Amino acid sequence: RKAVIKNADMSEEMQQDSVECATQALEKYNIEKDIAAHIKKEFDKKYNPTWHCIVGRNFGSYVTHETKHFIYFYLGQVAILLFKSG
Amino acid sequence: IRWETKSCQTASIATASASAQARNHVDAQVQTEAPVPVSVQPPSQY
């Protein structure tokens, strides 16, 4: 559904691709762990490992990421955190 | 005057995939029954 980006330290191409990838993941999967897995795997292939993805409605996080490889956005009420580290 | 050449190497590492998931939900359905095991007029003799 509607994608709203709140935070990003990421190129415009990866930002839009992250949304597109998450959008397809959310259409394909209902379970967050599987939505995250889809998004993560696609990023490792296109932008090299190692990415990590968290998908959910209720959480807090504290993570360390590589420069220019972090985004946090919503698709409707579901938040997606995607970043590279390692 | 003696310069010796040497080559060094560090050990490799190994990673593994994993996942997390919060608690899961599942649907359910119920229909209330309306049994009426009631006669009209039992002639009691209490």
Curated annotation (Swiss-Prot), chain A:
Tissue: Ubiquitous. Expressed in testis.
Protein's name in the database: Dynein light chain 1, cytoplasmic
GO annotation, cellular component aspect: axon cytoplasm; centrosome; ciliary tip; cilium; cytoplasm; cytoplasmic dynein complex; cytoskeleton; cytosol
Organism: Homo sapiens
SMART domains referenced in this protein's UniProt entry, alphabetically: Dynein_light
Any one Gene Ontology BP term: negative regulation of phosphorylation
Record lineage: Eukaryota, Metazoa, Chordata, Craniata, Vertebrata
Location (main, coarse): cytoplasm
Keywords annotated in UniProt: Acetylation, Activator, Apoptosis, Chromosome, Cytoplasm, Cytoskeleton, DNA damage, Dynein, Host-virus interaction, Isopeptide bond, Microtubule, Mitochondrion, Motor protein, Nucleus, Phosphoprotein, Transcription, Transcription regulation, Transport, Ubl conjugation
Cross-link (Glycyl lysine isopeptide (Lys-Gly) (interchain with G-Cter in SUMO2)): K40
Pfam families, per database record: Dynein_light
Subunit structure: Homodimer. Monomer; the monomeric form is incapable of binding to target proteins. The cytoplasmic dynein 1 complex consists of two catalytic heavy chains (HCs) and a number of non-catalytic subunits presented by intermediate chains (ICs), light intermediate chains (LICs) and light chains (LCs); the composition seems to vary in respect to the IC, LIC and LC composition. The heavy chain homodimer serves as a scaffold for the probable homodimeric assembly of the respective non-catalytic subunits. The ICs and LICs bind directly to the HC dimer and the LCs assemble on the IC dimer. (Microbial infection) Interacts with human spumaretrovirus Gag protein; this interaction is critical for intracellular microtubule-dependent viral genome transport toward the centrosome.
UniProtKB/Swiss-Prot annotation, chain B:
Annotated stretches, region: DYNLL2 binding: 23-36
Bilayer-crossing regions: none
Tissue expression remark: Expressed in several cell lines (at protein level).
Domain of life per record: Eukaryota
Location(s), subcellular: Cytoplasm; Cytoplasm, Cytoskeleton, Cilium basal body; Cytoplasm, Cytoskeleton, Cilium axoneme; Cytoplasm, Cytoskeleton, Microtubule organizing center, Centrosome
Family named by the database record: Belongs to the dynein light intermediate chain family.
Subunit (UniProt): The cytoplasmic dynein 2 complex consists of two catalytic heavy chains (HCs) and a number of non-catalytic subunits presented by intermediate chains (ICs), light intermediate chains (LICs) and light chains (LCs). Among them, a heavy chain (DYNC2H1), two intermediate chains (DYNC2I2 and DYNC2I1), a light intermediate chain (DYNC2LI1), and a light chain (DYNLT2B) are unique to the cytoplasmic dynein complex 2, but a subset of the light chains are also shared by dynein-1 and dynein-2 complexes.
Physiological role: Acts as one of several non-catalytic accessory components of the cytoplasmic dynein 2 complex (dynein-2 complex), a motor protein complex that drives the movement of cargos along microtubules within cilia and flagella in concert with the intraflagellar transport (IFT) system. DYNC2I2 plays a major role in retrograde ciliary protein trafficking and in ciliogenesis. Required also to maintain a functional transition zone.
Disease involvement: Short-rib thoracic dysplasia 11 with or without polydactyly: A form of short-rib thoracic dysplasia, a group of autosomal recessive ciliopathies that are characterized by a constricted thoracic cage, short ribs, shortened tubular bones, and a 'trident' appearance of the acetabular roof. Polydactyly is variably present. Non-skeletal involvement can include cleft lip/palate as well as anomalies of major organs such as the brain, eye, heart, kidneys, liver, pancreas, intestines, and genitalia.
Protein name per Swiss-Prot or TrEMBL: Cytoplasmic dynein 2 intermediate chain 2
Residues shown, of full length: 58 to 103 of 536
